[PDB]
Amino acid sequence: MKDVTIIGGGPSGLYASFYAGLRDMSVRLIDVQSELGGKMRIYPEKIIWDIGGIAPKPCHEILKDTIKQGLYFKPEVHLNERVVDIRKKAERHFEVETEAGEIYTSKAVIIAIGAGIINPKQLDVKGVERYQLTNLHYVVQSYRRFKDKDVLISGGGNTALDWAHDIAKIAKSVTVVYRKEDVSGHEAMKTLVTDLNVKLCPKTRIKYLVETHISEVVLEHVESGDRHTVKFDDVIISHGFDRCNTLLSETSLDMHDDCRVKGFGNTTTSIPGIYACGDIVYHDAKSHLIASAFSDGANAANLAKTYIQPDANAEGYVSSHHEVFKEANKTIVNKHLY
Amino acid sequence: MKDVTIIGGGPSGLYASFYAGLRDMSVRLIDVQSELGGKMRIYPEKIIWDIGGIAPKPCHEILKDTIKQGLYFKPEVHLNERVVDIRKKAERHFEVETEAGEIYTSKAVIIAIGAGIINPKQLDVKGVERYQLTNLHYVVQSYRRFKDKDVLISGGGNTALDWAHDIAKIAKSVTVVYRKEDVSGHEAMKTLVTDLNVKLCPKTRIKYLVGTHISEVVLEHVESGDRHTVKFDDVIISHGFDRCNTLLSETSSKLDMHDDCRVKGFGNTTTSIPGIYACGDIVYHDAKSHLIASAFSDGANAANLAKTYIQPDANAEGYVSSHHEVFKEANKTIVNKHLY
Ligand SMILES: Cc1cc2nc3c(=O)[nH]c(=O)nc-3n(C[C@H](O)[C@H](O)[C@H](O)COP(=O)(O)OP(=O)(O)OC[C@H]3O[C@@H](n4cnc5c(N)ncnc54)[C@H](O)[C@@H]3O)c2cc1C
Ligand SMILES: Cc1cc2nc3c(=O)[nH]c(=O)nc-3n(C[C@H](O)[C@H](O)[C@H](O)COP(=O)(O)OP(=O)(O)OC[C@H]3O[C@@H](n4cnc5c(N)ncnc54)[C@H](O)[C@@H]3O)c2cc1C
């Protein structure tokens, strides 16, 4: 039987998997996506600067190292599987059940689900390669950059309609492309419907993206198939993250008022043996950063080790002098593999 | 007036400087060492694996990346200066004083001193280069690896004397070199002194490391100057950390202290005095680990909390770098020129 089941294969679950492996714990890692990476799979070409110790480079470059790290100790990885229920039969005996009816047993459970199911949209770039695009945005934080710009937003989700309203305050025009039939979310539209500079284009998708910036967008109607090319200055692809729509409403934990797992000072949850790491947990030391997802992962692995084996050391051995790496260290130095 | 004064140039102080710069804060970074890096300067050649997202590579390589990161926004760096006093005159008005009498003013103070003054011993390696050495150790965790080896330990601190006893259980012989007459504490020496395979060599220093791995050590007697060459299989240089001997016991501002001489963190890097924040190994909160990974996440939180202290109406957290406008000009060059 596996020592710990980690729910979520994002940076927090990946690092949690690594650090649990460093402490000689058996790990099962489950993620709903077809590939590991979590939210990092949404913005692969964007350059990340705020990860500690990592010189700026594409997210997809950093992700390859981070995935490898999560798998140093080679855990049992289960992709394309969606957890739907968590059960505590007894102390050090948990059942994790998927939607397909698969039941996995573990002595502890680490919940690293971020904000819920992530399903990155597959963008098709023509003329240029996606990796050199600069004016392609997957999140809006500062929006002063959109002054007098023609902005395209893909998706009719609540988040996309909220973005559209914020951007409309200073943008010249906003076009919201989505398919379905009519928008998702009543409240976002009542706010949005009074933005007289927002054009709604239902049943329409972004087809192709046409130096170092997107210059034109081919939009295409889902039914007729008619295409027309519109020039834009910035493109924003939403995905629709909505906390409060996770598995955590129907499992049987104390919840923060914003639908984050309430962390009791750290990654400790309201059930001994269940620990939450990453964006999903709230404690006073949390940041919405990859750096915090990592430090959360370590704490969840540490607390789970001492949960399974109370007399074990509180923390793991520093890797610089850890005996398991000694064989590899000689090869790295002799061959200059860095 | 400086926005924030950061005391300590380790990974926690380095990241805090960077993230404070990301939040458009003026930064002063002060450190007593002659080079930035803190504890990372003790084990430069050692391979570090447990830092998130970083493929294993030499500590000195990761340190180079971390220093560069701390200096993107080019803060005011004060090296070879040892802070001795912290004073809070009023809100958004702090005085940071060094031993030379220099007084630096800041609206907030970030304490990133780790465990206190770090002073790496300068090893002189002859025959080999230090960076490809494997049997040179700065910490002992697992000690089964020393089975039937001739081991040298430099330093007479409690930790070094503890290592010697533990290592002595299975090693062929242990030699403990140090310079003090007693190196303080009867019992650690008394435990070790009855390990009949341990040779205590007081008033003795390491002079030369002679060698992939070190094969022999040139030892020199202090005062007399006598040298003798001894072959060893492993060399362990201890440093002696004591969290109870920092400036925080004798300053003009009393933060609440944890019972282990760590700053009491009120859930995170918040301290008992608004405007003073502790990040890194120095602070205690329930989410702490004694890892470089935790020093980074502490630094971010400390930069965030200082920002909302100086500007209450500022955003609680900083903009994610992937979409942060300050990097956009550089991003095109990095992308266009494939600078990665
Ligand atoms: C656009 C964007 C840019 C960012 N840029 C930065 C940056 O530059 N620097 C930085 O420090 N931080 C950044 N962040 C912060 C971000 O939170 C982290 O990068 C990272 O996503 C942390 O997520 P996580 O570890 O909680 O896991 P996540 O990335 O949230 O992934 C969780 C994983 O669990 C899976 N999952 C969810 N529910 C279930 C379920 N029920 N069953 C099974 N699997 C499930 C998901 O599909 C996913 O694979 C950014 C965030 C976004 C959205
Ligand atoms: C894989 C791994 C291996 C590790 N191996 C080791 C190891 O072998 N040995 C070890 O000791 N740690 C080791 N660590 C711990 C790690 O190096 C530290 O946790 C890290 O350096 C934390 O940095 P910090 O800035 O919080 O503290 P520090 O690195 O100690 O930073 C303190 C800095 O502030 C300065 N300073 C202190 N007081 C003052 C003052 N009054 N005025 C001015 N400057 C001052 C110090 O000189 C120093 O530059 C390891 C960690 C990991 C993850």
Side-chain angles (χ1 to χ4, degrees), chain A residues 40-87 89-90 92-99:
Chain A
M40 298 186 66
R41 299 194 66 235
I42 83 180
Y43 52 103
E45 77 273 14
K46 293 300 258 179
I47 309 89
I48 303 186
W49 294 63
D50 48 20
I51 304 175
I54 299 189
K57 69 177 70 175
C59 167
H60 70 266
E61 291 285 71
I62 298 174
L63 179 53
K64 307 217 223 67
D65 295 331
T66 303
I67 290 175
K68 285 207 301 272
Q69 183 174 51
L71 305 182
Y72 288 159
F73 300 90
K74 303 291 173 319
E76 184 179 298
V77 177
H78 295 265
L79 294 177
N80 302 75
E81 296 187 47
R82 177 195 193 182
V83 184
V84 297
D85 187 22
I86 306 176
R87 304 187 286 271
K89 307 301 207 180
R92 303 175 247 277
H93 186 357
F94 293 85
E95 288 187 354
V96 176
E97 181 173 333
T98 67
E99 175 171 67

Side-chain angles (χ1 to χ4, degrees), chain A residues 223-226 228-235:
Chain A
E223 297 179 297
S224 60
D226 288 283
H228 59 285
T229 306
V230 188
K231 299 180 286 313
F232 294 101
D233 295 317
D234 289 287
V235 174

Side-chain angles (χ1 to χ4, degrees), chain A residues 15 46 49-53 56 66 69 72 138-139 141 266 284 288 295 315 317 319 321 323 326 329 338, chain B residues 15 47 49-51 53 56 58 69 72 138-139 141-142 145 268 286 290 296-297 317-319 321-323 331:
Chain A
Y15 191 91
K46 293 300 258 179
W49 294 63
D50 48 20
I51 304 175
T66 303
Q69 183 174 51
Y72 288 159
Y138 305 100
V139 155
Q141 298 242 322
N266 43 32
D284 295 333
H288 67 83
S295 57
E315 300 195 22
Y317 297 135
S319 68
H321 292 66
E323 208 165 351
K326 278 197 325 194
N329 282 347
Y338 53 92
Chain B
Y15 191 91
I47 309 303
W49 293 62
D50 49 19
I51 304 176
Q69 183 174 51
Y72 290 156
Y138 305 100
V139 157
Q141 298 241 321
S142 165
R145 142 191 190 65
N268 43 32
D286 294 333
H290 292 83
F296 285 153
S297 57
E317 301 195 22
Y319 297 135
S321 68
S322 65
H323 292 66
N331 282 347

Side-chain angles (χ1 to χ4, degrees), chain A residues 274-304:
Chain A
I274 299 181
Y275 304 92
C277 58
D279 289 352
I280 188 57
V281 74
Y282 172 80
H283 57 73
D284 295 333
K286 278 301 299 177
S287 294
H288 67 83
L289 298 172
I290 298 170
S292 184
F294 285 154
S295 57
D296 276 350
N299 182 254
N302 286 327
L303 291 174

